[PDB]
Amino acid sequence: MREIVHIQAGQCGNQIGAKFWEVISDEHGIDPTGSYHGDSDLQLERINVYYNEATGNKYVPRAILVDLEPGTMDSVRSGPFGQIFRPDNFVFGQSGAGNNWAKGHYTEGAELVDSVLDVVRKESESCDCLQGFQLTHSLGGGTGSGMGTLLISKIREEYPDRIMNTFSVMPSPKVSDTVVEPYNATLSVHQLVENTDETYCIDNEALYDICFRTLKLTTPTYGDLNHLVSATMSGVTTCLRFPGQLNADLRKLAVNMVPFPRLHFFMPGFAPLTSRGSQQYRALTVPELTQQMFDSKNMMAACDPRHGRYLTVAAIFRGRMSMKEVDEQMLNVQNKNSSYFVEWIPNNVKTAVCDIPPRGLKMSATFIGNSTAIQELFKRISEQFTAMFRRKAFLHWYTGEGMDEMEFTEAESNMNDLVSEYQQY
Amino acid sequence: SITVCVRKRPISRKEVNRKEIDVISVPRKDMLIVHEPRSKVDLTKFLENHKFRFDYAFNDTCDNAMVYKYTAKPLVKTIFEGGMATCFAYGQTGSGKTHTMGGEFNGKVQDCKNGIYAMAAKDVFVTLNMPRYRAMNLVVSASFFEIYSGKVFDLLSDKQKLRVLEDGKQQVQVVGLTEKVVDGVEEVLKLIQHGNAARTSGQTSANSNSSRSHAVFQIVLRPQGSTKIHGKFSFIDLAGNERGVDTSSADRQTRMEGAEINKSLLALKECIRALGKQSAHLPFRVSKLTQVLRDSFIGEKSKTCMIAMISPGLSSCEHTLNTLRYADRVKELVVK
Amino acid sequence: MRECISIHVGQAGVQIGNACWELYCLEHGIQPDGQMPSDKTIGGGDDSFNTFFSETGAGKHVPRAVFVDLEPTVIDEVRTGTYRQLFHPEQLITGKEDAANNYARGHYTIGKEIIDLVLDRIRKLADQCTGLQGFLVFHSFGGGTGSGFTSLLMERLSVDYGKKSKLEFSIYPAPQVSTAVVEPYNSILTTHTTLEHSDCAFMVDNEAIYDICRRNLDIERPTYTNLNRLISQIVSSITASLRFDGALNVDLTEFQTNLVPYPRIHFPLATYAPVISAEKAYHEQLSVAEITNACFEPANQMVKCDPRHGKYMACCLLYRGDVVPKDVNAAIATIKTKRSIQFVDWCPTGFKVGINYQPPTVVPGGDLAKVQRAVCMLSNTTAIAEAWARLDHKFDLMYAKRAFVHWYVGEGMEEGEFSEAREDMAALEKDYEEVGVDS
Numbered sequence A: 001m002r003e004i005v006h007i008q009a010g011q012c013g014n015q016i017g018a019k020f021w022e023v024i025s026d027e028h029g030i031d032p033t034g035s036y037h038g039d040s041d042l043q044l045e046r047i048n049v050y051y052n053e054a055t056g057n058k059y060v061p062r063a064i065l066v067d068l069e070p071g072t073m074d075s076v077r078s079g080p081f082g083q084i085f086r087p088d089n090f091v092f093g094q095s096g097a098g099n100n101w102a103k104g105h106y107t108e109g110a111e112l113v114d115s116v117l118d119v120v121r122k123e124s125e126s127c128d129c130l131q132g133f134q135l136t137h138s139l140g141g142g143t144g145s146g147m148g149t150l151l152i153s154k155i156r157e158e159y160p161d162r163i164m165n166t167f168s169v170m171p172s173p174k175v176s177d178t179v180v181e182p183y184n185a186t187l188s189v190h191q192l193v194e195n196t197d198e199t200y201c202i203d204n205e206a207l208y209d210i211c212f213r214t215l216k217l218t219t220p221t222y223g224d225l226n227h228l229v230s231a232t233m234s235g236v237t238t239c240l241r242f243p244g245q246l247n248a249d250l251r252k253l254a255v256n257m258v259p260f261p262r263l264h265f266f267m268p269g270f271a272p273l274t275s276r277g278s279q280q281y282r283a284l285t286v287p288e289l290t291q292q293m294f295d296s297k298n299m300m301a302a303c304d305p306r307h308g309r310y311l312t313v314a315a316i317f318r319g320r321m322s323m324k325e326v327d328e329q330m331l332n333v334q335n336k337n338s339s340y341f342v343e344w345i346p347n348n349v350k351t352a353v354c355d356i357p358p359r360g361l362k363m364s365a366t367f368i369g370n371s372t373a374i375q376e377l378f379k380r381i382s383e384q385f386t387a388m389f390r391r392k393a394f395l396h397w398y399t400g401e402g403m404d405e406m407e408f409t410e411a412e413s414n415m416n417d418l419v420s421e422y423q424q425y
Numbered sequence B: 001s002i003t004v005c006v007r008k009r010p011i012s013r014k015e016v017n018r019k020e021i022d023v024i025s026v027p028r029k030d031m032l033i034v035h036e037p038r039s040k041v042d043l044t045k046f047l048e049n050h051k052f053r054f055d056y057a058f059n060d061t062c063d064n065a066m067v068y069k070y071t072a073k074p075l076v077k078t079i080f081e082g083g084m085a086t087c088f089a090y091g092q093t094g095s096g097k098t099h100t101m102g103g104e105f106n107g108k109v110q111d112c113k114n115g116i117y118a119m120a121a122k123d124v125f126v127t128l129n130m131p132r133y134r135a136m137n138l139v140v141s142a143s144f145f146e147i148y149s150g151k152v153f154d155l156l157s158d159k160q161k162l163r164v165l166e167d168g169k170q171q172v173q174v175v176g177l178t179e180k181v182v183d184g185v186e187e188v189l190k191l192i193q194h195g196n197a198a199r200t201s202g203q204t205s206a207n208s209n210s211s212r213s214h215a216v217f218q219i220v221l222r223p224q225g226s227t228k229i230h231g232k233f234s235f236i237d238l239a240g241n242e243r244g245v246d247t248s249s250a251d252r253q254t255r256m257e258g259a260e261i262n263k264s265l266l267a268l269k270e271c272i273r274a275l276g277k278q279s280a281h282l283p284f285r286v287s288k289l290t291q292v293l294r295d296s297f298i299g300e301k302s303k304t305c306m307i308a309m310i311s312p313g314l315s316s317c318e319h320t321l322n323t324l325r326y327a328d329r330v331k332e333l334v335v336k
Numbered sequence C: 001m002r003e004c005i006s007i008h009v010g011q012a013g014v015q016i017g018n019a020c021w022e023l024y025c026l027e028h029g030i031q032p033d034g035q036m037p038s039d040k041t042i043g044g045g046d047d048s049f050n051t052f053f054s055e056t057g058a059g060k061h062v063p064r065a066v067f068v069d070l071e072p073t074v075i076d077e078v079r080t081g082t083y084r085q086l087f088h089p090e091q092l093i094t095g096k097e098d099a100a101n102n103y104a105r106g107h108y109t110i111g112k113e114i115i116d117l118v119l120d121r122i123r124k125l126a127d128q129c130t131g132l133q134g135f136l137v138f139h140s141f142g143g144g145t146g147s148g149f150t151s152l153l154m155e156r157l158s159v160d161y162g163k164k165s166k167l168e169f170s171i172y173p174a175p176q177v178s179t180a181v182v183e184p185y186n187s188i189l190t191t192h193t194t195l196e197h198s199d200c201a202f203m204v205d206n207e208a209i210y211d212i213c214r215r216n217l218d219i220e221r222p223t224y225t226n227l228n229r230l231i232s233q234i235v236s237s238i239t240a241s242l243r244f245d246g247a248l249n250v251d252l253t254e255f256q257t258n259l260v261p262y263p264r265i266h267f268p269l270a271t272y273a274p275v276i277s278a279e280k281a282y283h284e285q286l287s288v289a290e291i292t293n294a295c296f297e298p299a300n301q302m303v304k305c306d307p308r309h310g311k312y313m314a315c316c317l318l319y320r321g322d323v324v325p326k327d328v329n330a331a332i333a334t335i336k337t338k339r340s341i342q343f344v345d346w347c348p349t350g351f352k353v354g355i356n357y358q359p360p361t362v363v364p365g366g367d368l369a370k371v372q373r374a375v376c377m378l379s380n381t382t383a384i385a386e387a388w389a390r391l392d393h394k395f396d397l398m399y400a401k402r403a404f405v406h407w408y409v410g411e412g413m414e415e416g417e418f419s420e421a422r423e424d425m426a427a428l429e430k431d432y433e434e435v436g437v438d439s
């Protein structure tokens, strides 16, 4: 009825899909060996959303996990997050494309989609209503941006009636591998924007700027930043198995968050902002985190919310708390700041309270915003791309790999049109 | 600098059996009046008259040669000056759109001797044989699209799926289309007869050859031995919005293309009004049908001619006021 | 003969129906099985039982309704809970997919395979209902399948029956409960199609129901188990007036006779007299004359508007419990002496008396009063022209730059049907000014 087939690819897709499962298996309280040990019926009726069925409180958690190089496939099968899922979804490749978007899309990456699409054709006929396709990948890599963007088109031309969202990861100059990728970026955005519905804009330019200043983690790893992004991805999908006053299914989330005919890159906020297990924090009071959702710093996308006029401000609350104070503290913003949220929607969505607390936080929150502050994550990519391109530098890594020189020009001009589309004030 | 014309189509035989009332009157050369039945709050029915003035208005007794002579015939002395020129076919479904552009619907076949494609491709060649323009030594080549499910197909080659890319000079180029070289007028009729036989169309009893795609026919005017483009005449037959009573037998396949015809025209409806006001970001890249039609509006050497098609009866009075209001908005446009 | 069939669809149609059929079966004294007690309850006595119900061949009583909803989760509350054996599974229709805050989905493309089954099964109710009195549909404005199925539903009954009237008791959401951003869109697309089919519409507005539960109950929790209590008491007013032999019968066509001056506007108000929550012991039971002196002055929080600056057209009261008729006509002389009651220039006529027998029965656990004095007037005003000016102002500015339009078009809507629905409501807003003319 309300079934979800999940898919992910790439190193960043696989270094968060393990982090995605460990958070939701402790907020729902799921045993990592395959079983379940919980108490509430809030966490028990909704077991058919992601998961299959088997006897003895066991199942197979279906999510297509694929990359060509076998070093990543052997790194997400070690721990208790390894034996949780189906071994027949072990879909790997022969030769990993070395951060080449071209080999992951046309020459080599367009070979083993038939070993991926055959898995999706069997996880579709077993369900009864498929209510989405989710995707986690990096926007500037190899098969994470090559194969992960191609598998959208192979399913969208076969299941066009399904709302598709992608958990996007913009790259950054500070945390960087295969140092130059505005070529890998805008080729991965151009086929994304033309083929998706919802797009969560996560960048490593803001996930490193917070840790340099607020959390004081000056030199972290990917896994320290994988912890930050895996806390929001449970704060988003808590409106899928924990119902409330805002029954906020993904198709209903699609209609309630997309004003203009083209998709836009969502800029989520966060709860009070620490790492795992860190003390020295106050009680998570409701009127305090209103300033922590509308902060100019607490954003999961490096932007400027003081200038970006709000369009959709749907923020999901989690934890047993007072319903009266939630309704009052939101009215200290639109009734005082007419430029931050502006006049497009009468009675815009501003709350959805969940009672089940996350694993480690009591009375937390999850801000999900969308505004014209996402100009600056289009101008900083394009200015780093137009310096790459008006001298035709590093052009020969794609032209000998079955590409076209003038496909850059559309994907350049498609991004410049987005910025001029955002000055609708 | 856009010329707008309107064409009332006559009443079919089946609409006489259902006793349909005709409400569209074309009394003069360039006027039209919509007679709208309205009732007041006390059940006292009255009648509204919606006057319109266009560049030229067509009756219901006009043939396709007269529609040609005032729409696409002046635009042939433009393609031989270096410019480019297009023409639309914009209206409700069933409103005679592919009867004007494609040809006279002769039941099981398509009499392509009529239509605006053939009558202009003939008139290029007569213009090309004048001694004033024979001196330029041009080569006429023709291509022919199809826009189905938002994607561009091809009809000269059988099913070549096509891409929509862009040059650095902000010029849309479908690539790689088939561009055959046309010898004479007996050659260009062989393209159109073979072209319409492969166009994707539904099969029912009411409209057995209803349009399901936005067909685009181009005639490319090239100098010999230069591989530039000196002129283009790009015909556009639309598919037409359909949302009145289309609930006959529509499965998951029928409304799959069905909601994508309507999606492609809202993107076309927005680019008209966005060009109406000023400085806004013109949403040309929403639907690919609007990306093809980009050079029609903002072209510096573009002279278009939209032919607004109108269903005549009472039950289509709602779509009629919708369709005529955009063509009046198309007429009141000054680009540059 | 005097039987009628109601229809309960949507999230605001079954949660109301879970507070109404419990409230209906408590007046007759009906078990959660549906068996009859020994209060001479073997066959219908002096009271007519089968207004909403039906006596089956098994001796017990069967209620008659239409339960259709897209989500199977709501009917699973009914197919497992209290009344899981009163309703036959033929009157329990569940869909699979969801409308999902979309008028275009719930209208036809999910109605392609349900209304061929609904019209098959209300035709089954032709042999079980020899005489029909009409229809009473419950749905919601501004939502998903409540606005989706409703405009489909009226088209398929007027071709089959036509002569039978229907009242809609509809809900659009609140600024306090704002479950979608397209709430002005889905509301105006079902006061378009239904406006040629609806006869009396009651705007049960959550923007003023919650203001009652804030002041009279001091409960700031907008829950659907306490807000549906206040709504179902208003429906219980009309219920016993066609069920029990009251002192003055008010027929369905006779009630429409005084509330519908022109069939174009036909929007009366659900101005129920608000009461106080008695939690343990009441301090003073009010009388009949004390209600109507100050009933319509706080009954303006039913549609959040200002009747004291528009003009009235008519009024029809409806009493429950024990009310002496000679006590009624003393309080009406004071309010007629006042100039606040402003009618049109062409009808200064006062009201209509409707008196029933039984008090509004009370399910325990609620936060309402246990009384026997109940007054429910249902009047139509020309002051609600500016009530529709709010929604058109909430429809104009989501549409001047064509925001959210592609979601309806993406599921099969043309751009003209917006302006067709807007122009059919810009006339209706000017129809109330057309009626309220001093000539």
Ligand SMILES: Nc1nc2c(ncn2[C@@H]2O[C@H](COP(=O)(O)OP(=O)(O)OP(=O)(O)O)[C@@H](O)[C@H]2O)c(=O)[nH]1
Pocket (backbone or CB within 6 Å): C010, C011, C012, C013, C015, C016, C098, C099, C100, C101, C102, C139, C140, C142, C143, C144, C145, C146, C147, C171, C172, C173, C174, C177, C178, C179, C206, C224, C227, C228
């Ligand atoms: N007062 C009240 N309003 C309700 C109730 N249920 C739904 N609503 C109203 O309905 C609106 C939401 O749209 P719905 O009619 O519920 O849509 P739906 O029937 O759930 O169908 P979907 O949106 O597709 O899930 C809100 O504005 C609510 O005010 C209810 O039980 N009581």
Ligand SMILES: Nc1ncnc2c1ncn2[C@@H]1O[C@H](COP(=O)(O)OP(=O)(O)NP(=O)(O)O)[C@@H](O)[C@H]1O
Pocket (backbone or CB within 6 Å): B008, B009, B010, B060, B062, B092, B093, B094, B095, B096, B097, B098, B099, B100, B104, B105, B106, B207, B209, B210, B211, B212, B238, B239, B240
């Ligand atoms: N001016 C005309 N005189 C006589 N018959 C006409 C005229 N215009 C259209 N028709 C007839 O109308 C019918 C349907 O016309 P058609 O051109 O298919 O409308 P349409 O809008 O193009 N439908 P579609 O193809 O889906 O866009 C055919 O039988 C035509 O011959």
Ligand SMILES: Nc1nc2c(ncn2[C@@H]2O[C@H](COP(=O)(O)OP(=O)(O)O)[C@@H](O)[C@H]2O)c(=O)[nH]1
Pocket (backbone or CB within 6 Å): A010, A011, A012, A013, A015, A016, A097, A098, A099, A100, A138, A140, A141, A142, A143, A144, A145, A169, A171, A172, A175, A176, A177, A178, A204, A222, A223, A225, A226
């Ligand atoms: N934040 C974050 N970014 C990552 C992670 N892993 C990879 N990336 C980003 O992804 C890019 C590398 O893409 P990758 O997946 O390795 O390419 P591929 O393996 O060839 O498909 C780098 O620029 C990183 O910024 C991760 O765990 N966290």
Ligand SMILES: [Mg+2]
Pocket (backbone or CB within 6 Å): B096, B097, B098, B099, B210, B211, B238, B239
């Ligand atoms: Mg046609």
Ligand SMILES: [Mg+2]
Pocket (backbone or CB within 6 Å): C011, C071, C144
């Ligand atoms: Mg619902």
